[PDB]
Structures are given as C-alpha cells and as structure tokens.
Amino acid sequence: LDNGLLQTPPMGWLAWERFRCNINCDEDPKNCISEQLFMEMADRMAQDGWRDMGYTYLNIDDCWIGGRDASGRLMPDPKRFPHGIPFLADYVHSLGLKLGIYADMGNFTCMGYPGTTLDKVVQDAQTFAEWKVDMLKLDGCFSTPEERAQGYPKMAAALNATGRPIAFSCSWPAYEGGLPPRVQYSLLADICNLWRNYDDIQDSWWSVLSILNWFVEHQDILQPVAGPGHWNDPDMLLIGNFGLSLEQSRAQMALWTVLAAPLLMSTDLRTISAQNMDILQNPLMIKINQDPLGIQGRRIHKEKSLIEVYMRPLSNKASALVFFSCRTDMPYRYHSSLGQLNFTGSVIYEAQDVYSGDIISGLRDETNFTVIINPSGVVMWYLYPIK
Amino acid sequence: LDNGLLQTPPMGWLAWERFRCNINCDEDPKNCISEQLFMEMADRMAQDGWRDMGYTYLNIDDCWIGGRDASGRLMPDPKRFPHGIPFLADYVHSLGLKLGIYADMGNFTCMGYPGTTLDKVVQDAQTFAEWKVDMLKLDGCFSTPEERAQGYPKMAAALNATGRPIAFSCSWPAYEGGLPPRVQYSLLADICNLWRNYDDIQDSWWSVLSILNWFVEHQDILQPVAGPGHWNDPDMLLIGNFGLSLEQSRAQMALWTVLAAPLLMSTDLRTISAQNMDILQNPLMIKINQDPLGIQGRRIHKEKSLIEVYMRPLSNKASALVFFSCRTDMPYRYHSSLGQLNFTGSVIYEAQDVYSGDIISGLRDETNFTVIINPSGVVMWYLYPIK
Numbered sequence A, B: 001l002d003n004g005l006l007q008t009p010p011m012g013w014l015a016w017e018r019f020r021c022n023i024n025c026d027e028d029p030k031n032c033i034s035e036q037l038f039m040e041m042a043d044r045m046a047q048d049g050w051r052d053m054g055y056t057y058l059n060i061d062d063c064w065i066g067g068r069d070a071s072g073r074l075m076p077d078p079k080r081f082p083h084g085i086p087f088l089a090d091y092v093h094s095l096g097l098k099l100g101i102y103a104d105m106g107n108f109t110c111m112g113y114p115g116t117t118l119d120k121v122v123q124d125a126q127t128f129a130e131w132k133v134d135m136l137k138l139d140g141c142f143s144t145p146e147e148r149a150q151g152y153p154k155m156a157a158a159l160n161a162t163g164r165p166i167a168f169s170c171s172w173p174a175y176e177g178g179l180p181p182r183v184q185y186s187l188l189a190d191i192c193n194l195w196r197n198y199d200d201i202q203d204s205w206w207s208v209l210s211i212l213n214w215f216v217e218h219q220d221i222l223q224p225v226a227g228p229g230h231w232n233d234p235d236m237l238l239i240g241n242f243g244l245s246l247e248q249s250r251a252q253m254a255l256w257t258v259l260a261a262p263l264l265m266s267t268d269l270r271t272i273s274a275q276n277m278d279i280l281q282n283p284l285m286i287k288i289n290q291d292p293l294g295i296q297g298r299r300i301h302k303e304k305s306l307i308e309v310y311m312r313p314l315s316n317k318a319s320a321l322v323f324f325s326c327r328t329d330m331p332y333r334y335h336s337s338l339g340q341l342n343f344t345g346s347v348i349y350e351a352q353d354v355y356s357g358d359i360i361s362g363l364r365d366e367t368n369f370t371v372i373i374n375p376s377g378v379v380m381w382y383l384y385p386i387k
C-alpha cells in the first residue's frame, strides 16, 4: 500500500495469541482484554527496551467492541475500556508508541462482536482516524468472497480519505486459500501494507512448522510480492509463551526474520524471561529483519539429513543464512561451503553468528565449514564480503 | 517376568535418545558412545542425587559392539571401550548402580552391528552374565516374525539359566503392531520385565503426543497387563533435551508417572539445568511412579475444552490425578469436582499439587474446584482421604 508506511516490516505487540478473547475481568482482572492490560503492556514496551529496539506498535485484537451508538458509531466495551479508545491512543502516543485496532469485514468479528459491514466501512475508518489509531487489522469472518472483494479496497480508500496515515493489515487472502487464482497478489500489494496468507498460529511447534511448510511450498509465488510497504504475514511470534522450547523459540525468530515477516510479539511482557527477551531484542536479528531492501528470503537447500538452508539478500552485498534442523535426534554437524550454497566466486566473506556473536572470517567459496545445529533449532549467520 | 526384579518400574538412564549412534570419538570425544561417556554419567548419577532418588540403571544401547572373537563371543569396540565391559560393570557397581546392555534378536542390530541370532542367544546371555550385566534390552531389527516368536522366549530361558538376575526389556511387541491377536500379552508378561509396545520416541512434543494417543486408544487392552515385574514401556523421557518446552517436560513426567512407565532418562546429565533436574527428582512424583501396587493409570475423562483427566490408583487408598491441557492458546481454568471424576462415598479428601507442593483440603465429592492448566501442560494432584 502506497501510504509511505511500513517501509520495513512492522514490529510490536498484538494481544490475540496470548490473551485471546478473555473477557472475565471479575475473575481474571490481570489477563482479561481491558484498558488496564494495554496500558500495562505499553508501560513495559516503554520501560523494558522494546520501543528502543524498534517494537513500536501496541495492537488491540478481537473482543474489544461493546456495540454501536445511536449514530451507528463503534464503541468499546464500557466496563473493560472505561476511558475509551482516544484515552488509550493518547497514552500510547505519550510513550512514543503507536496503537493498532481491530475490525472485521463482515457481519461479526470472528468472536461474534459487532462487524464492520459494507455500509459501516467508511464510518468505522473515520472513527478510527478520529481516535488517532495508527494501524488496523481487518479480519474477514462472517462475510462472502464478494463482500471481501468490495470491502478490503473500500476500507483502504476510506482510511486514505481520513488523511491520517494508518497501517493496513488484511486477513483477506487467508479466507480464499492464500493462493492464485483466487488470490491476486498484485492487487493485495496495492491495497494492504501486510496480509495474513494462511492459518492462525497456535502455541505449538507443529503450528510453526505447518506455517513454514506452507510458505516454503509456495515461495516461488510469495517471495517476489513482499517488499517495502507490502509484506507477507505468517502471523505472531510465540516467543515467551508455553509451546516452544528454547531451540524452537530461536528458530521462529530467525526464520520469521529471513522471511521478512512482521515481528509481532504476543506474550506477557510483565513476566517474560531474560532468555526470551534476549531472543526478541537481538540487535543484529532486528537489523536483518529491518533491512531497507525488504527482500523476502527463500529456502535454498534441503538435505536428506533434514538440514534446510534459508538465505535472505540484504543491503551492502550482505546476506543472512539460516541453517535449520528438522531432525529430532541430537545436535548435527552440518558440513558445507559457500560455493555449495551458490555464492559468487573470488569474493572473500566474513560471518557473524547472530546468536553467539562469534565471527568466522576469511571464507572463500571453496572453504569448508561446519555448523553444529540442535534438533528443531537453527544456526544463523550474517554474511558480508571483506576487502 | 517372575525373576524378582522390577517390582516397581525401572528408573535410570539410557544412552539412545540423546547420544544415538555417535561413534566419532576423534571429533566428538565428549559425546560419542564410549566407556568415558558411561563412566561420566555414572559419576553424575552417584554425585547429583540421581541414584539416591532411585535412578539406578545405567544402560548401554546400540553401537557398542566391536565384533565377535574367534570363539563367537561378543566384544565391545576396543577403541571406544578399551578397558572392556567387566571393568565398566565393576565401576558402575562400585557407585551403587546397575549396568544395562543392548542386543538385537536378528542378523544385525538396528544400526547394523553384530546381531544376536538364534544360535548366539545362549552364548550372548552367558557372556552378559559373566560380565555382571544387570539389564538387557533386546531389539528386533533384521529378523522375521517366526525368529522373534522363537528368540524372545529363547533369551528369557537363556538369561534364567545363567543364574544371574538380569532385567529383561523386550522390543518384541513393537514389531508386531503392539496389539492382539498378533501380540500375546499374557506370554510377554511371563517372559519380560518390560516391553516396548510402540514407536521409538523422538525429541518432539508431536512424538510424545502420538505415543500418548496410542496408549490411550488401546488402554482397555494395555492397562490390565501392567504390574510388578512386568511393565508397558512407552519409551524414554525427553526431559533435559531440545524438543520439549518447560510445560511439555512437566507433562511427560506426570503422564509417564500415571501410566506406571519406566523412568528412563536419556539426556546429558553433565549439563542438565536445575529446572529440568527438579522435574526428574521430584520426590512425590517418584513415590507415585514407584507405588508398590504397580497399577497402571488410565485416562478417565476427555472434554470438548480439550482438557483430559488421567487417574492412577495408589497404595493406602490414595490416587494420582493429572489434568492435561491439549489446548494451544492460553492458561485454562478447569472447573470440576471429585464426584464428576467418578469418586464415590462420603470420603473427604485432601490433595497435594505435585509440582507446586500446595495443599488443597476439604475436598468432598460435591466440592467444586478449579485448576489452572497451561497449554500442552499439566496440573498434578496426589489425592488421599483425611481422617
């Protein structure tokens, strides 16, 4: 979408994965979807290094809506959001952060809350802009294909007409199978800043692998359409939650990074471990994810040893390499060379291990190297020519 | 098997899952299958509380064999086991531990090492006894159904004839689909101390789940056949390795415990985290696993919320309850009562949470209670009448 926004993938926090549709504030006041929850997460982002590292969006998902007023104007739940959305937008802005909100192109949101039907698209966009929202996620539950085909372009135009820059996240392709001929990616790039291609992520390694598999099976289609202002969205990071081991956590981070994915956390920032914080706030990882060229990476190799190699092209002739083990036995000594990974001749390279910080220098194409990769884990290199 | 052994499930350490068939001692001397590996693990077991907590077996798996001498007698790899197996057994015995070894009923072991064919069964049994081995795992790769039908009882007879008590672990049923009529569990109980019913475990939550689902699907057949001296074996514990998150590690421990499974670790005891050690050395968990009645537990409840309830009967009118979440979203508040879990009478109960140590008093059958269960995780209770 040509609105000047998201020239690099968006970084932030989204409520959905970790907190879902928890509306029981009586029994569970700390974890229910509420004004308090968002202010508390905002405080953590401001104070715990998140904002400073580039995590700027604080995004509301489903289950925020209370109803519509006599003018059809959208309202938050008055008990869970007593001060209203402008209050929250203003609070978040006061901390140098941006606020994301959620609507559904259809009769109801996926959780059954008031939907943004075709006749409400313009009014809701205007309401969101008036509230000083900075991003919109538009789901597409409880709608027909033709309603979505009209509704998503209609919303992009309505957001534009408000005059406020609002990043536009579209779940549109996910409801249509995410692939041609039903999904037109040139159209999508014109109307959206990012799009959810595929299934909701769940808190499991199986879920991460099914998403990765789908993106890799279809990378010839998906890879070229990603770029500044228009990203593929494989869904939220699971780092900090319950389903992923340490190796798996480091793996999702590295792989989302090579895919030029949004880095949208969804985890309790109040209790996040140092180890998980260290993954998400890795400066070189973020640098790679936020590379100005915005070229989505690809899987370039798959061995019978079940080691996969991903490569992302970066600025200044640099590259990112992810050595990924789909083995489920033990650490594996992966033997390779840059020549075997289709790198250009005569150039001498140097690599920094993204997780360990170690530097491997004087690598020619013919130079044999070994990387030790743990099961369901990665080794990641930031690779550059040296003179 | 009526050999006086394993009146409770065996507890110890097995090399396979974590260290596999790593024989490259030149490049990897600290992790290869060698006498050093086993000696170092023995030290850890003696010094780090493992033995004192009941972890007594230190078991060699595949890839130990060098060959057979001129008389057909098995010999360990001379380079990797320079002092020989008697020496290792002596070392292990001096630390108050027991030595397990590995053989295959067929032409070769699964990794292609010299097999214990039918004409070698007796000689190999005598060799193991002479070495002062305490346990034998007998794999069934590279054999026919008829050879296994002959060989497994042949080995049991051979072991008995040596006069040395040797715990006998049989992989026989796993090669036959693990079910009647192909598997005769009455015979297995008479000839083996434990048997691998099903697929090899791998370092993933998916692997744990597939084993659990197979054991639950067929629990009507499998639950009754387990007891003192003869156990179902759903394979090694993954705790301390790469594939399981914290919640998942706690889940496998609790679930293997209610199933009266062997507690056979397979992990690097030299680098194991305090957090993982705390799981495996939980005193109440071990007490429950090692309950004298040896009654295998069952899944008693399954709900649409994807919460499952397991129950194991214990000595002194006590029970173990495992509340298990197959959810992949967020913590779940599970509401129940002992009455809904088929507890009858006017007995008043008290429960101890096995992981937190918290005590819940005044539980009558009608009493409503709530437990908070994390995704792919458990809450475990030790439940008992109070008077």
Ligand SMILES: *[C@@H]1O[C@H](CO)[C@@H](O[C@@H]2O[C@H](CO)[C@@H](O[C@@H]3O[C@H](CO[C@H]4O[C@H](CO)[C@@H](O)[C@H](O)[C@@H]4O)[C@@H](O)[C@H](O[C@H]4O[C@H](CO)[C@@H](O)[C@H](O)[C@@H]4O)[C@@H]3O)[C@H](O)[C@H]2NC(C)=O)[C@H](O)[C@H]1NC(C)=O
Pocket (backbone or CB within 6 Å): A002, A003, A004, A159, A160, A161, A162, A163, A164, A165, A166
């Ligand atoms: C509502 O929708 C409108 C129309 O879609 C948006 O307006 C566009 O905004 C974008 C982003 O700000 C503009 O793109 C930028 O244009 C700059 C100048 O272009 C001029 O010249 C061209 C002809 O060559 C004209 O088409 C145009 O009208 C301008 O007069 C460029 O310099 C910018 O370059 C950027 O990208 C290059 C290469 O990728 C980089 O090297 C640069 O560093 C730089 O980042 C950029 O392309 C676009 O021109 C606007 N279009 C129109 C018709 O006005 C609104 O932003 C949007 N409003 C809201 C609120 O969402």
Ligand SMILES: *[C@@H]1O[C@H](CO)[C@@H](O[C@@H]2O[C@H](CO)[C@@H](O[C@@H]3O[C@H](CO[C@H]4O[C@H](CO)[C@@H](O)[C@H](O)[C@@H]4O)[C@@H](O)[C@H](O[C@H]4O[C@H](CO)[C@@H](O)[C@H](O)[C@@H]4O)[C@@H]3O)[C@H](O)[C@H]2NC(C)=O)[C@H](O)[C@H]1NC(C)=O
Pocket (backbone or CB within 6 Å): B002, B003, B004, B005, B159, B160, B161, B162, B163, B164, B165, B166
């Ligand atoms: C080769 O195979 C034979 C079986 O064919 C094995 O022999 C069995 O060995 C076990 C274990 O040593 C014996 O079980 C033990 O029996 C002891 C005495 O029981 C006798 O008396 C009763 C009378 O009712 C007879 O029925 C029975 O046949 C015996 O003659 C008990 O003292 C033992 O009790 C143990 O457990 C209790 C817990 O309940 C503890 O309190 C005790 O301390 C003790 O540990 C035990 O039950 C069994 O009797 C033998 N069977 C036969 C038919 O002889 C060989 O062991 C095996 N050889 C090898 C090397 O593998």
Ligand SMILES: *[C@@H]1O[C@H](CO[C@@H]2O[C@@H](C)[C@@H](O)[C@@H](O)[C@@H]2O)[C@@H](O[C@@H]2O[C@H](CO)[C@@H](O[C@@H]3O[C@H](CO)[C@@H](O)[C@H](O)[C@@H]3O)[C@H](O)[C@H]2NC(C)=O)[C@H](O)[C@H]1NC(C)=O
Pocket (backbone or CB within 6 Å): A107, A142, A143, A144
């Ligand atoms: C999106 O929502 C519209 C608007 O209807 C509203 O939402 C519905 C879920 C109901 O709660 C309505 O009370 C409410 O006004 C839906 O259009 C309407 O759907 C209803 C119910 O399906 C239709 O009524 C039915 O008519 C048929 C045929 O005569 C009867 O068999 C049924 O017994 C029932 O009376 C109604 O005609 C229709 N209205 C219009 C103007 O089209 C729409 O279905 C829904 N779309 C999707 C894709 O979810």
Ligand SMILES: *[C@@H]1O[C@H](CO[C@@H]2O[C@@H](C)[C@@H](O)[C@@H](O)[C@@H]2O)[C@@H](O[C@@H]2O[C@H](CO)[C@@H](O)[C@H](O)[C@H]2NC(C)=O)[C@H](O)[C@H]1NC(C)=O
Pocket (backbone or CB within 6 Å): B107, B142, B143, B144
């Ligand atoms: C276990 O091994 C026996 C022994 O034969 C060996 O394997 C043969 C395939 C061949 O490589 C010989 O040099 C080895 O000595 C197998 O029994 C043989 O099976 C083959 C069928 O492939 C048959 O032609 C021979 O008559 C058999 N030999 C004898 C003397 O019995 C047996 O098949 C192997 N079992 C399994 C299931 O792997």
Ligand SMILES: *[C@@H]1O[C@H](CO)[C@@H](O)[C@H](O)[C@H]1NC(C)=O
Pocket (backbone or CB within 6 Å): A366, A367, A368
């Ligand atoms: C890399 O190692 C291989 C052995 O697998 C060897 O054949 C080859 O010569 C080495 N590459 C070079 C040119 O250094």
Ligand SMILES: *[C@@H]1O[C@H](CO)[C@@H](O)[C@H](O)[C@H]1NC(C)=O
Pocket (backbone or CB within 6 Å): B335, B366, B367, B368
């Ligand atoms: C237990 O809770 C249910 C509601 O979940 C209620 O209907 C029932 O009366 C309660 N029983 C007792 C003994 O409090």
